[PDB]
């Protein structure tokens, strides 16, 4: 089927949505679409149909999200861990991906009309070369759309994403763009595949499984974890609705927590900074009553701002470069 499944919410869906939209609504939901194989078994159907049904549900689910005014959605489609499955299965999964990403071109009309930007996050170099090219074109085609964001995590793990992000800032070091003392929380954030997106308000996993399975570990540390027993291909609007209801119940507490953590980080930063300014001034001699420390603080800050902004534009470069090269 298509990628965009145009559907108007029904009466009860519509009504319950209105009541819910009165409270805090998530801006970004992420999904571990797990349980396709158990579903196929349950339905006495072939494995591949299970995964195909899984893709159908993703298309249906994105429409639900769009109808609720939730503009960003991240999904886990394929883990690096998944390569260890039988060649039969992974070839099947790889073929599915080819099919869907190829069909995306024939849907350019609906993509513009609906304004859906598609990003594919992972260690893509591990995929078959044909698939990389396919994905790359898909990404380039939608890059300028803005009404709805879908992030498909393919050949992805969290650890890989994290390592990659540190490697990227070690590359900044080797390329003399980054000095060790500039590596921080923010900078790491900004070197993840997910850097264009805010952290997900909700993370949902569909099997009865109570593990994250190496998914958005950094991004979902302060987010609402919802584990629902339903197998992914059987997901319903109401499952989603229950997720949002959990989010709304947790919202106040998770906000307090998120601010506390932010306030404590700015504190522990202004602390570790003010101290660096001390060693320098004690070793120099002069030590204040004419805003001496205050001026050394503006400096260390602006040094970072200029030099991190510099590292960033060069990282964006390198990403676009590999995007253009592999999607030509």
């Amino acid at each position: 089927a298509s990628w965009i499944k145009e559907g108007e919410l029904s009466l009860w869906e519509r009504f319950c949505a209105n009541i819910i939209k009165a409270g805090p609504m998530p801006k970004h939901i992420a999904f571990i679409m797990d349980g396709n194989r158990r579903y196929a078994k349950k339905c006495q159907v072939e494995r591949q149909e299970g995964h195909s049904q899984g893709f159908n549900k993703l298309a249906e689910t994105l429409r639900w999200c769009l109808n609720l005014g939730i503009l960003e959605v991240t999904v886990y489609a394929f883990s690096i861990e998944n390569f260890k499955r039988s060649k039969s299965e992974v070839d099947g999964l790889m073929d599915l991906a080819r099919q869907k990403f190829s069909r995306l071109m024939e849907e350019k009309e609906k993509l513009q009309k609906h304004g859906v930007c598609i990003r594919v996050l992972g260690d893509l170099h591990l995929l078959p070369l044909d698939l990389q090219e396919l994905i790359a074109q898909a990404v380039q085609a939608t890059k300028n759309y803005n009404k709805c964001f879908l992030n498909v995590c393919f050949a992805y793990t969290s650890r890989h994403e994290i390592s990659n992000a540190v490697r990227e800032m070690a590359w900044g070091v080797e390329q003399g763009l980054l000095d060790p003392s500039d590596i921080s929380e923010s900078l790491l954030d900004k070197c993840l595949y997910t850097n264009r997106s805010p952290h997900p308000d909700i993370l949902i996993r569909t099997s009865g499984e109570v593990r994250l399975s190496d998914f958005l570990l950094w991004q979902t540390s302060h987010s609402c974890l919802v584990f629902q027993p339903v197998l992914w291909p059987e997901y319903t609007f109401w499952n989603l609705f229950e997720a949002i209801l959990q989010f709304q119940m947790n919202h106040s507490m998770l906000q307090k927590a998120r601010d506390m953590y932010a306030e404590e980080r700015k504190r522990q930063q202004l602390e570790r900074d003010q101290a660096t300014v001390t060693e320098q001034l004690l070793r120099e001699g002069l030590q204040g009553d004419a805003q001496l420390r205050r001026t050394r603080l503006h400096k260390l800050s602006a040094r970072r701002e200029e030099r991190v902004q510099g590292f960033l534009q060069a990282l964006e470069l390198k990403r676009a470069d590999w995007l253009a090269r592999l999607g030509t």
Partner: protein, 195 residues
């Protein structure tokens, strides 16, 4: 009565599997040390090697001694070798043990990059994992989350990638049977590891 040490070891040996490393995450911010201490010693009694204790407000970090005080007390009922075995097996954590520590390690690798000692390319997953180990401490297999919040709230994001997360509404009056129920849950879980 010492037939209680034999019982608790029998309970552990009886489960299909036990966590080598258990995490205890407390989310509750309404108000309590004896309960947490009871959990810790139960863990030790059944045969769990490591126990982490975590709260997002760092209350336990700031109260390490008062906590280890109760643990050592509760532990004897059911001195220096006993103090060493709790320090080894029990870790008290706050947020700074999570992401901040990953930044910490990131920095330690970028100086080796400045030193022309290491190339960016040398940092696979496994290297980062090593830079992020203790000694014996593996990744926690089971985290018992207590309280109303559906979040790990910053608990070891890196290490928590395959951890089974079991939720209990409160730690306030926690019973052994309630604790063991969680262990039975973990023992029955299926781990596919991507296959």
């Amino acid at each position: 009565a010492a037939h209680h040490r034999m019982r608790w070891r029998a309970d552990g040996r009886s489960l299909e599997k036990l966590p080598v490393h258990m995490g205890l995450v407390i989310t509750e911010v309404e108000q309590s040390f004896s309960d947490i201490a009871s959990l810790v010693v139960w863990c030790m009694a059944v045969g769990i090697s490591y126990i982490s204790v975590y709260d997002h407000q760092g209350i336990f970090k700031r109260n390490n001694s008062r906590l280890m005080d109760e643990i050592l007390k509760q532990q004897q009922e059911l001195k220096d070798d006993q103090v060493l075995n709790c320090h080894l097996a029990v870790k008290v954590l706050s947020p700074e043990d999570g992401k901040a520590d990953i930044v910490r390690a990131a920095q330690d690798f970028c100086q080796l990059v400045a030193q022309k000692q290491k190339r960016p390319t040398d940092l696979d997953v496994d290297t980062l994992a090593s830079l992020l180990s203790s000694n014996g401490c593996p990744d926690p297999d089971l985290v018992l989350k207590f309280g109303p919040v559906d979040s790990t709230l910053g608990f070891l994001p890196w290490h928590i990638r395959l951890t089974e997360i079991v939720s209990l509404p409160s730690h306030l009056n926690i019973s052994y049977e309630d604790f063991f129920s969680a262990l039975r849950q973990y023992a029955a879980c299926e781990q596919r590891l991507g296959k």
